[PDB]
Amino acid sequence: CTLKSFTVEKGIYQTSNFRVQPTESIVRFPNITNLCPFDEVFNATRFASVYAWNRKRISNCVADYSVLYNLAPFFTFKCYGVSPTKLNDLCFTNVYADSFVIRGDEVRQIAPGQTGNIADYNYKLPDDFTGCVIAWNSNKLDSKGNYNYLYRLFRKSNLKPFERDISTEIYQAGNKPCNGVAGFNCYFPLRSYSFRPTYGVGHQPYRVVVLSFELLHAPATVCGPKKSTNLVKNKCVNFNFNGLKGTGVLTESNKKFLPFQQFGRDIADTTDAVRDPQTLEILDITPCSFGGVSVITPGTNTSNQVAVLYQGVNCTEVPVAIHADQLTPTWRVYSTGSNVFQTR
Amino acid sequence: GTGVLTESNKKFLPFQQFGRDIADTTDAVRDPQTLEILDITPCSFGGVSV
Amino acid sequence: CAQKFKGLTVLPPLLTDEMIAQYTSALLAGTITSGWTFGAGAA
Amino acid sequence: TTRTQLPPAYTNSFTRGVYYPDKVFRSSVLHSTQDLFLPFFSNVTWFHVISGTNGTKRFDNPVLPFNDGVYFASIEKSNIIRGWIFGTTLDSKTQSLLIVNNATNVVIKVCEFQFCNDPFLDHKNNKSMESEFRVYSSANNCTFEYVSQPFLMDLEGKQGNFKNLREFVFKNIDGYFKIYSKHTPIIVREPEDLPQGFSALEPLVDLPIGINITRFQTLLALHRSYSGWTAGAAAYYVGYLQPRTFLLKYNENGTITDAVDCALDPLSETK
Amino acid sequence: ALGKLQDVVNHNAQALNTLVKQLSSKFGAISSVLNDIFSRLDPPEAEVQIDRLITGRLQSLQTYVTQQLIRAAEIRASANLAATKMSECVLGQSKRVD
Amino acid sequence: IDRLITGRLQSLQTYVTQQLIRAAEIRASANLAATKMSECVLGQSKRVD
Amino acid sequence: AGCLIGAEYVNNSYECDIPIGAGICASYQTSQSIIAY
Amino acid sequence: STECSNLLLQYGSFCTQLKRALTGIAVEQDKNTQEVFAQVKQIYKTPPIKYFGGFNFSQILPDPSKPSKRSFIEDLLFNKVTLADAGFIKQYGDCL
Amino acid sequence: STECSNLLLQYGSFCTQLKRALTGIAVEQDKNTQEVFAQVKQIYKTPPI
Numbered sequence A: 001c002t003l004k005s006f007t008v009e010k011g012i013y014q015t016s017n018f019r020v021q022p023t024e025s026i027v028r029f030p031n032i033t034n035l036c037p038f039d040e041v042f043n044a045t046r047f048a049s050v051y052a053w054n055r056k057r058i059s060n061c062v063a064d065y066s067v068l069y070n071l072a073p074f075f076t077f078k079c080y081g082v083s084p085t086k087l088n089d090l091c092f093t094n095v096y097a098d099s100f101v102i103r104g105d106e107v108r109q110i111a112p113g114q115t116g117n118i119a120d121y122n123y124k125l126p127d128d129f130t131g132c133v134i135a136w137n138s139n140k141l142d143s144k145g146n147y148n149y150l151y152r153l154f155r156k157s158n159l160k161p162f163e164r165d166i167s168t169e170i171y172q173a174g175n176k177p178c179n180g181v182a183g184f185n186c187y188f189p190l191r192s193y194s195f196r197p198t199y200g201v202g203h204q205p206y207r208v209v210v211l212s213f214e215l216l217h218a219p220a221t222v223c224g225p226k227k228s229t230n231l232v233k234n235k236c237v238n239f240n241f242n243g244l245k246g247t248g249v250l251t252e253s254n255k256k257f258l259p260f261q262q263f264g265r266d267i268a269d270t271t272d273a274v275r276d277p278q279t280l281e282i283l284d285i286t287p288c289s290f291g292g293v294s295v296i297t298p299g300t301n302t303s304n305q306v307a308v309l310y311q312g313v314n315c316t317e318v319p320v321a322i323h324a325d326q327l328t329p330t331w332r333v334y335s336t337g338s339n340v341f342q343t344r
Numbered sequence B: 001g002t003g004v005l006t007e008s009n010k011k012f013l014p015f016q017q018f019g020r021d022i023a024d025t026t027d028a029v030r031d032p033q034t035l036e037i038l039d040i041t042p043c044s045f046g047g048v049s050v
Numbered sequence C: 001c002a003q004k005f006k007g008l009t010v011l012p013p014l015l016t017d018e019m020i021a022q023y024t025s026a027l028l029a030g031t032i033t034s035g036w037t038f039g040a041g042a043a
Numbered sequence D: 001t002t003r004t005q006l007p008p009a010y011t012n013s014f015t016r017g018v019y020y021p022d023k024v025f026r027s028s029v030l031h032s033t034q035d036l037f038l039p040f041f042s043n044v045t046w047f048h049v050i051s052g053t054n055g056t057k058r059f060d061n062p063v064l065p066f067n068d069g070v071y072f073a074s075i076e077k078s079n080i081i082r083g084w085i086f087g088t089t090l091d092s093k094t095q096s097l098l099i100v101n102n103a104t105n106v107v108i109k110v111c112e113f114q115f116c117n118d119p120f121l122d123h124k125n126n127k128s129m130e131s132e133f134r135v136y137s138s139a140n141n142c143t144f145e146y147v148s149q150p151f152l153m154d155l156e157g158k159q160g161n162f163k164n165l166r167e168f169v170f171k172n173i174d175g176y177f178k179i180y181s182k183h184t185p186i187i188v189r190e191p192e193d194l195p196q197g198f199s200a201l202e203p204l205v206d207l208p209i210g211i212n213i214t215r216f217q218t219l220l221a222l223h224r225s226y227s228g229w230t231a232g233a234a235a236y237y238v239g240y241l242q243p244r245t246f247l248l249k250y251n252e253n254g255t256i257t258d259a260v261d262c263a264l265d266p267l268s269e270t271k
Numbered sequence E: 001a002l003g004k005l006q007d008v009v010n011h012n013a014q015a016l017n018t019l020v021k022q023l024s025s026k027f028g029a030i031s032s033v034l035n036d037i038f039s040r041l042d043p044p045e046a047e048v049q050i051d052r053l054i055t056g057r058l059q060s061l062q063t064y065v066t067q068q069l070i071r072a073a074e075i076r077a078s079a080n081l082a083a084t085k086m087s088e089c090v091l092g093q094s095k096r097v098d
Numbered sequence F: 001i002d003r004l005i006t007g008r009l010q011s012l013q014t015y016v017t018q019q020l021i022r023a024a025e026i027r028a029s030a031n032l033a034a035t036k037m038s039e040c041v042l043g044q045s046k047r048v049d
Numbered sequence G: 001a002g003c004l005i006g007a008e009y010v011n012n013s014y015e016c017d018i019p020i021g022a023g024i025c026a027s028y029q030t031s032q033s034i035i036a037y
Numbered sequence H: 001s002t003e004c005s006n007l008l009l010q011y012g013s014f015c016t017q018l019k020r021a022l023t024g025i026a027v028e029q030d031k032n033t034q035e036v037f038a039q040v041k042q043i044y045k046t047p048p049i050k051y052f053g054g055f056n057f058s059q060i061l062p063d064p065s066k067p068s069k070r071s072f073i074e075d076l077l078f079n080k081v082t083l084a085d086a087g088f089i090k091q092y093g094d095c096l
Numbered sequence I: 001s002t003e004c005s006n007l008l009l010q011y012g013s014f015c016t017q018l019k020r021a022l023t024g025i026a027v028e029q030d031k032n033t034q035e036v037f038a039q040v041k042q043i044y045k046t047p048p049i
């Protein structure tokens, strides 16, 4: 097949490679955590405007996304750049739901990639925002002439992200500063927020909340729990230490980590050791064996007998009787009837 | 662009505005205020050795 | 001048055009006044 | 008091101000990292906390801008300095920090406080709760609290003739506050210059607060003249930080034993 | 004086080291780790994200093969010269100067 | 700019490869010249042509 | 070749040690300093 | 990465020529040594008496006082070049 | 363009390898010249006659 011919001459050829698949899945997560209320961050008789920016802190909690669907009025949980299916068990650190209420009539502007007048003056929305868009059916409760929800339409100039408008500084466009008069070319934020029912389909402020995201910069803080399983030794398994995917053989190690040090690396800028998340034990990560296969044949014009050479692997690791979990299914190579010879 | 603006000896035609060279790069420009064109040469650059 | 710019330069040779001429003149003088004995030891 | 000004001087920092940049443990490798570090052979100011005018309190708590980092150090014989109050303008309207060492707790108190003109503490506890908390009188609103063991594990109960070499780096960036520290013994009694020797600043604690800091202030502990409020001799160093490129040489143990920058001199860039 | 033999080993080691180190390059992608880029992206763009890394790694391998062939040519030339020198100096007496 | 950088890098790599290829020919010519110098100038050669 | 800073020129002619270029070489000799010739 | 194996299949044959070139390079490397050294079809032996007209060849003739029949100068060269080599071991046993 | 350098920086080190490859040829040229021309130990001179 690999020479694409029905006749093979005398020689040695390289055909494929062999490897060992993982046999077990091991997950090791910290056993300390707290309950995570997704929509209990706010608790008041009446909500406030964007200028509030005051909320309780949510952290070190089990962020089970099934709780989001458990609530009746929760609708939006999809991330624009990341599929929610993978997000169902993804772990993040220091994620909190911001408390700010906006009209919400610009759905495309909230998502990264677009900036507008509201982004120019009220609150900047940069084209590269790590936060996602989260929304739920709560317009009727928040919405109610009525200008209690003040918004800053005009400002000095464009503002950098996190430079929110807290202290009202009205625009100055003259020799004298605006002093107590809302004269020409001088505007005040005191105007109705369009609470009238003339646009009953939707114009009232809709609670759009963006949540800050961190990607494995620190050990996982907020995410749902998973079934912890005891670690195994001397077996090619799928290890899930600290929420990091991997596959290899776990064994005891003597890598003297510092009290704060967690990971380990070598000259090949790849992981080499890991510390147990539960007990104070140090283990070195190494993948299970692999190599190449060479076929020695005298030629199809003489005989169909062949000999198989395994490169760089001892005879004990890969005998001809192992068929439990490996590549090369039909590759039995018979048995020890023909003696195995160990070469360099 | 950045370059050492200096006096130029090129004889641009009365309508001509820009200048070019063999490598297709800007070489001279028309003066907006006056009718005397100028040369553009990048200032010194090079590598070091220890 | 000579294209230049865009980070394209030419490094000068280690041996100038005069040392090569001196080497050739020395070889000619040795061949004329010694034959082939100057290539295996003393002239 | 009606104290007078003092002229700040400078001294050579030699090779100082190196901390572990990353959590990953590596050994026998020569990794190069790009981060903020104290440049080698840079000017560092060395305020001398001595008995002012033989018993007159001095204003040795300057309102030094924080900029991007500090290299606060100490060659104190005993414990005189506690307090690293930060603030945008040091008033009741600005969120401020303070690292006190009351009893055996750091007491990380993140709130707004009204600060006196000359905040100071007492090293000896008052007789019969002490009245040491005179640095502030009112606290309005509070967000975060952190109580744990004191940052300072050094003890003077053994004997004298040996001083401390406390070193600290206060780095605040992108809503995080990291603290690094290390202590080593000193042989020579001369406080003019730091001894030439490599030291590693192992991290101690991380803070998730996102406060805006534009200034740095320090506090002193003066219990009593035993006129005014005074104690023994002390000295601390203040040094700023700017981004640089460094090369670190880990050992077999996995600890940084030497480092070479890449901007000091042509030989450094060649290396 | 055995620098000629050491130069070949140094060149091969340096080429292998730079080939290994080239794996950490992002090639303009979001992340350099396959697991992270797979878990943190949707199928619509994960394909092109993986394709960019694939193209970069193929270019690196093609380059490495090219300089390996170039070095092999010079090694073969040196081996031919050494064989000629052996056959002409050891098995007989040579009248060629120098 | 990413695509522009990739194109310019490809052009630079091609130029470097061509220079490396030509260097081998120059090396072979230099070796032949050195051998001819040592065998014709410093002595008398019995090799035909 | 260019502008050289940090070396003192000498009129004595020695065997080349570090090739600067264009027939000029530099070496460390005799108190002790780097010279170009 | 099981998916990447399927994605790379869309690029045609970008692995066969690389393997063929590397195999050709290895074969040429073997052929070079065979050409340079294998020049005699007989294995001659030096006489037991080591007197050749007064010339002393003890520093280049092999000696049987070592497991490897290498001369003194050959041992010096091997010790000089052993700073870097292939590794002298390829059985994977010592690889952790 | 410093921003172009920033968007180039994530392509690893594709410049050091090219610099080394070109410096190899630059060094080899001088050796090529010296092997051919520097074949004598002394600078002989011819008599005035």
Ligand SMILES: *[C@@H]1O[C@H](CO)[C@@H](O[C@@H]2O[C@H](CO)[C@@H](O[C@@H]3O[C@H](CO)[C@@H](O)[C@H](O)[C@@H]3O)[C@H](O)[C@H]2NC(C)=O)[C@H](O)[C@H]1NC(C)=O
Binding pocket: D251, D252, D253
């Ligand atoms: C790496 O760190 C260790 C300290 O943790 C440095 O010192 C080494 O410490 C170990 C532990 O005590 C020593 O082992 C001891 O050796 C004595 C014989 O000298 C033996 O009687 C004890 O029972 C114990 O096994 C070790 O000797 C000591 N030194 C070395 C070179 O390992 C170590 O030096 C650090 N590594 C380097 C490269 O500096």
Ligand SMILES: *[C@@H]1O[C@H](CO)[C@@H](O[C@@H]2O[C@H](CO)[C@@H](O[C@@H]3O[C@H](CO)[C@@H](O)[C@H](O)[C@@H]3O)[C@H](O)[C@H]2NC(C)=O)[C@H](O)[C@H]1NC(C)=O
Binding pocket: H056, H057, H058, H059
């Ligand atoms: C041919 O050359 C070899 C190598 O030079 C000669 O062998 C050397 O002979 C000298 C003279 O005895 C040895 O020096 C001394 O040898 C004694 C032997 O016990 C030793 O204890 C002394 O410390 C001192 O080294 C020398 O070791 C020896 N070399 C070797 C490698 O054995 C040999 O004699 C020469 N043959 C003729 C016919 O000239």
Ligand SMILES: *[C@@H]1O[C@H](CO)[C@@H](O)[C@H](O)[C@H]1NC(C)=O
Binding pocket: A030, A031, A032, A278
């Ligand atoms: C949970 O984690 C803590 C971490 O400090 C550890 O001390 C404790 O033993 C763990 N629980 C169990 C049951 O092992």
Ligand SMILES: *[C@@H]1O[C@H](CO)[C@@H](O)[C@H](O)[C@H]1NC(C)=O
Binding pocket: D009, D010, D011, D043
């Ligand atoms: C640095 O310190 C030296 C020595 O004290 C002093 O002469 C110099 O003015 C200082 N430079 C600055 C910028 O402080």
Ligand SMILES: *[C@@H]1O[C@H](CO)[C@@H](O)[C@H](O)[C@H]1NC(C)=O
Binding pocket: G011
């Ligand atoms: C060295 O040579 C220069 C001319 O190249 C000459 O001006 C100078 O005086 C000489 N110095 C001596 C001979 O010490």
Ligand SMILES: *[C@@H]1O[C@H](CO)[C@@H](O)[C@H](O)[C@H]1NC(C)=O
Binding pocket: A314, A315, A316, A317, A342, H091, H092, H093, H094
């Ligand atoms: C194979 O056997 C063991 C390990 O299986 C070890 O001695 C070494 O790796 C190999 N030994 C031999 C004699 O091949």
